[PDB]
Symmetry: C3
Subunit: 187 residues, 3 copies
């Protein structure tokens, strides 16, 4: 994982659960609590895994619930980093465009490997979006969608329709329903 996102995860945990929940979890993996992380350095994913587990232990929350909440928060932060990915979009545009956006981000943040997110309009008012990765961060995936709904102020319902691990990849498909048609024809 790139320092860019991780540095942000740390700071988001700090806002969510407090400083010396985060301080002590950081110590748990042998980091000084005020460790400075650079945007392009490589952080061991397992260290991140261990950090989030400790926060869970310390907070009484399941880690999946924490990843979800962090996913919710991060949409706003991403919107500050790259407002032009958000500007003038419908929510459904934003979600359908996200795989292509992640691909452009890999050309700008060397070594970044965001997941594949192929989205498909399956009905007049719904898409299916499939998360595909070597990393299995289902809950973060869902939180980011929820956070996207809040950012665009378009209500959705999200249902998991499929989950699975095949040939080294984690996969998760959701069906997302909107209040208006995806491709509405109007007067």
């Amino acid at each position: 994982m790139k320092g860019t996102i991780v540095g942000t995860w740390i700071k988001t945990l700090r806002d969510l659960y407090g400083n010396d929940v985060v301080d002590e979890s950081l110590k748990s993996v042998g980091w000084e609590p005020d460790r400075v992380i650079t945007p392009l350095e490589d952080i061991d994913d397992d260290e991140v895994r261990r950090i989030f587990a400790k926060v869970s232990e310390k907070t009484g929350k399941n880690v999946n619930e924490i990843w979800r909440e962090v996913g919710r928060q991060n949409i706003k932060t991403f919107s500050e980093w790259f407002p032009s990915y958000f500007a003038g979009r419908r929510l459904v545009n934003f979600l359908m465009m996200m795989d292509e956006v992640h691909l452009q981000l890999t050309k700008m943040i060397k070594g970044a490997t965001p997941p594949r997110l192929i989205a498909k309009p399956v009905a007049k008012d719904a898409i299916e979006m499939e998360y595909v990765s070597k990393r299995k961060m289902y809950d973060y995936f869902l939180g980011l969608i929820e956070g996207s709904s809040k950012f665009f102020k378009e209500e959705i319902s999200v249902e998991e329709v499929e989950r699975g691990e095949k040939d080294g990849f984690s996969r998760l498909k959701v069906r997302i329903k909107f209040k208006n048609p995806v491709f509405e024809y109007k007067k």
Copy 2:
């Protein structure tokens, strides 16, 4: 053709010529007049061709003129679907970018095969746009250009300079003149 665009055509034909005309046209090709079409289903092009023919027969309007008008109307609709492809562009930007947008759309609407649109800055205040497709929807192409002009509120003159079915591909080249330079200083 993908149901996405076909569903839109049907509704556009209904607004233009009425429900009873479209229903009967749908029936004439063996569809429920109220056929439910999903965004990604594959609709036979020849059935669409026949629907449009029957509408022309019933309204008395030449089918070419029907395509041109459907093209004029559809620009508005596309701008409601994907407003960020329109926002902050000059018309000439919009037209020159259209080939890449159609490509990005193939990545979002699986199996869509919109025409190739080679656009070239040919003179200071003019471009050439070449439509290249296996479908020969000349008038529709011309309608979308006209619709874009109205949407961006930039008057243009468009002259067809080339028409022909070279390969398995139909091709149509137009010269598009703007009131502004393409690359204005």
Copy 3:
């Protein structure tokens, strides 16, 4: 070089130093002073070099400072060509997106070959941008950066880190420092 860009430069040289310096510099390479330059014709690079050489000789200005000035001036023009590349971006966004933008320009302007511009966020408040080209227009590169800074109204500090030519390619690496973080939290 494509005529689209050469014509802009001619117009910029005229704005800066006047029609007489430019007219004589065009004649010097065998052009009519009012020769029409089409957006897609291909202009010989060495002719452009000699034109800029003659302008330097006639004005007394160092050719490097000329390219720098022209680069500063041109950002505003580019924003008139393609405002949607500037719209709603932060300066750091604009600079990191430029390589993909130059790549998409080659798809709209046939035969255009802008330099490769690899940018890397190297620190919390700075990026590295490496200019790489078959051509050697270091000062134009730097002026365009300064011009970007002015257009986006965001101050930067620019430091050269490395420059050099190998097997026909010129490279220039700068470090660009901002007043605000690249990936700001809250």
